[PDB]
Subunit: 105 residues, 2 copies
């Protein structure tokens, strides 16, 4: 079986938000998003995929549709297919998210 | 948007493993599994769904195919469609897992 210690996979990118693939199949993307202060995933729309952001470390501002939320460790936000969504690190510390997208875009 | 504090949703069941739905759509099941010592998710096979177990608290023994692993906090294991899989709490403390299944069985 495929098994990973997500703590070990964590890494950052000074140029832009790091997208770290953990597992992948046509059925889903299981990734880690590592955001340094000021970094973000630009707002976008997935025609037929749902996405869920879960905060592992730090805090980020998640945008889904016409609403925004402060996602702190232990919190998860759902972005249904068709809804514009994104995430921004507006804090002064790094943030790490477990992000699942299904099916694979 | 749907947003939840998973820490608040956590709960246990003395009769059997608790399955706590967080978010759900035809595209995926996003659940929390709460296992008291001795509890487990019986081994089974999903014809067309992949599943990923992520340990939030405690440790569990995950079985996928002909292999078993000790999943400690921060570790994730992938169970591809068609593979017999299950999870058992063989420790002396409770365990909490974030479990994603896609698509919804
Ligand atoms: Na991988
Ligand atoms: Na819910």
């Amino acid at each position: 079986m495929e098994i990973k210690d997500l703590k070990r996979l964590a890494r950052y990118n000074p140029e832009k938000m790091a997208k770290i693939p953990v597992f992948q199949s046509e059925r889903m993307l299981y990734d880690l998003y590592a955001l340094l202060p000021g970094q973000a995933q630009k707002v976008h729309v997935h025609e037929g995929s749902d996405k869920v952001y879960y905060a592992l470390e730090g805090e980020v501002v998640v945008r889904v549709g016409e609403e925004e939320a402060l996602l702190a460790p232990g919190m998860a936000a759902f972005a249904p297919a068709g809804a514009p969504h994104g995430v921004r690190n507006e804090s002064a510390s790094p943030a790490l998210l477990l992000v699942v997208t299904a099916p694979r875009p």
